[PDB]
Amino acid sequence: SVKIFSMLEKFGQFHWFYGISIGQFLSCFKRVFIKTRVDEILWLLYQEVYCQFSTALDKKFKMIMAMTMFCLYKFDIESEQYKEAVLTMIGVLSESSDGVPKLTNDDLRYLWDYVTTKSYIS
């Protein structure tokens, strides 16, 4: 929760409209319960906070938020090879680091097929 709030504070730092308040975040966390268990609360938290604070951002920041929240979840939950592969693929999207990823699950194969065929938007 504090990592997400720091992310949203950075979004509010970039533009005056994208600001975030602590009351809104706690209202969203209340709505999480209004609408392996701790991981289920964590997943519901991510889904609700994305569906709540995605509408306050434009297209580019929608993509930024979705990508970095998926990165946060998959990095904290899953293994190190997954993390390294995702950073290398985000880098080759960013054209700052160039290099093929190491094959392990299945979704990374689909992302690799999307990016090798130059389907950036996909």
Curated annotation (Swiss-Prot):
Cellular compartment(s): Cytoplasm, Cytoskeleton
Any further remark recorded for this protein: Present with 195 molecules/cell in log phase SD medium.
Subunit structure: The dynein complex consists of at least two heavy chains and a number of intermediate and light chains. Interacts with DYN3.
Domain notes: Dynein heavy chains probably consist of an N-terminal stem (which binds cargo and interacts with other dynein components), and the head or motor domain. The motor contains six tandemly-linked AAA domains in the head, which form a ring. A stalk-like structure (formed by two of the coiled coil domains) protrudes between AAA 4 and AAA 5 and terminates in a microtubule-binding site. A seventh domain may also contribute to this ring; it is not clear whether the N-terminus or the C-terminus forms this extra domain.
Known role: Cytoplasmic dynein acts as a motor for the intracellular retrograde motility of vesicles and organelles along microtubules. Dynein has ATPase activity; the force-producing power stroke is thought to occur on release of ADP. Required to maintain uniform nuclear distribution in hyphae. May play an important role in the proper orientation of the mitotic spindle into the budding daughter cell yeast. Probably required for normal progression of the cell cycle.
Annotated family: Belongs to the dynein heavy chain family.
Protein name: Dynein heavy chain, cytoplasmic
Protein's organism: Saccharomyces cerevisiae (strain ATCC 204508 / S288c) (Baker's yeast)
Residue range from the parent sequence: 3625 to 3758 of 4092
